[PDB]
Amino acid sequence: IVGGQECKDGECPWQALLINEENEGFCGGTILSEFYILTAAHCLYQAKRFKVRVGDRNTEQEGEAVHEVEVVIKHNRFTKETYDFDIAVLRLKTPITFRMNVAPACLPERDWAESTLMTQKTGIVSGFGRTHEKGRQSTRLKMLEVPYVDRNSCKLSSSFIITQNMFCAGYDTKQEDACQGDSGGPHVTRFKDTYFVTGIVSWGEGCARKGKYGIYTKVTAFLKWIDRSMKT
Amino acid sequence: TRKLCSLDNGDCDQFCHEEQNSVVCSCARGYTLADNGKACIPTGPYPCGKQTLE
Numbered sequence: 544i545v546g547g548q549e550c551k552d553g554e555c556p557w558q559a560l561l562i563n564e565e566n567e568g569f570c571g572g573t574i575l576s577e578f579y580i581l582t583a584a585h586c587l588y589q590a591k592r593f594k595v596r597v598g599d600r601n602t603e604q605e606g607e608a609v610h611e612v613e614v615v616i617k618h619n620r621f622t623k624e625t626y627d628f629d630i631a632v633l634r635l636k637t638p639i640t641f642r643m644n645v646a647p648a649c650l651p652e653r654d655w656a657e658s659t660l661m662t663q664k665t666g667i668v669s670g671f672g673r674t675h676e677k678g679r680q681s682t683r684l685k686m687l688e689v690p691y692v693d694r695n696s697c698k699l700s701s702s703f704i705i706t707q708n709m710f711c712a713g714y715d716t717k718q719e720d721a722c723q724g725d726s727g728g729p730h731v732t733r734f735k736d737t738y739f740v741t742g743i744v745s746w747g748e749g750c751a752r753k754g755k756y757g758i759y760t761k762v763t764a765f766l767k768w769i770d771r772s773m774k775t
Numbered sequence: 776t777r778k779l780c781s782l783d784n785g786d787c788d789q790f791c792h793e794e795q796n797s798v799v800c801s802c803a804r805g806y807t808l809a810d811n812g813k814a815c816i817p818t819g820p821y822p823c824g825k826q827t828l829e
């Protein structure tokens with residue numbers, strides 16, 4: 544996260560972090576339930592064996608619990624060539640215990656989310672990624688309000704094809720964006736003090752560059768898929 | 776112009792769906808719809824979508 548602020552105590556409890564064999568975060572995730580994490584499909588190629596950590600706001604200090612993954616469910620249409628269908632569900636070996644800073648984000652119903660959440664002014668993105676394009680990962684969990692960006696303006700801004708499985712959020716010039724290490728993580732939209740999963744950090748042309756926005760997997764396109772994935 | 780679910784989310788706390796030209800409210804898993812048929816009440820602790828206070 545470039546810009547924005549620290550998640551203060553209990554503000555981002557659906558955040559998950561995929562950690563490599565070296566105990567370092569390489570991607571984010573969203574807690575959907577005690578057994579399931581939502582992430583990006585492209586994050587499954589950024590490490591061989593990995594685990595999921597939750598309840599961590601400050602990685603340098605000590606809520607935290609590491610969980611092993613039992614099942615990796617990658618969307619079968621994802622490819623690196625297009626980045627389309629960039630979604631994956633993880634089933635954990637042991638259930639997450641909800642507590643301070645550890646709680647799931649709500650999955651919305653499709654029609655309602657599209658007419659009511661995705662038409663709100665902004666969503667919130669969060670993660671332990673870099674604090675500027677060429678810096679190092681953040682030791683602190685951060686969040687950022689990212690304006691939803693008109694599909695057209697976004698298609699015009701992009702050098703790659705924005706599919707219907709993607710949406711854009713962020714700023715044209717303001718130095719606030721998601722970045723490296725945030726991928727796979729949460730985009731949520733607040734409605735009457737309840738936070739709903741709206742997107743998955745997917746890709747961008749750098750981080751916070753002008754004329755450029757963050758590209759997010761459109762969770763509403765995948766609700767049935769997710770629902771299915773969570774039943775087995 | 777603005778009617779039912781397009782008028783302030785039909786007064787629902789969460790999901791609003793128009794059925795037979797009337798507002799029908801519903802809630803995410805782990806919440807139950809109150810007797811008023813609008814409010815969503817958490818069934819247990821750590822309901823989805825809420826920042827944690829404890």
Ligand SMILES: CS(=O)(=O)c1ccccc1-c1ccc(N2CC[C@H](NS(=O)(=O)CCc3ccc(Cl)s3)C2=O)c(F)c1
Pocket residue numbers: 623624625626703704720721722723724726744745746747748749750751756757758759
């Ligand atoms: C370049 S590509 O792989 O041919 C391709 C093809 C079709 C659609 C998109 C892309 C694409 C384009 C740019 C991509 N980049 C360039 C580097 C960047 N990596 S990152 O780890 O810094 C992610 C940064 C983000 C900023 C905002 C969000 Cl959201 S994610 C990133 O995601 C990328 F991963 C994929």
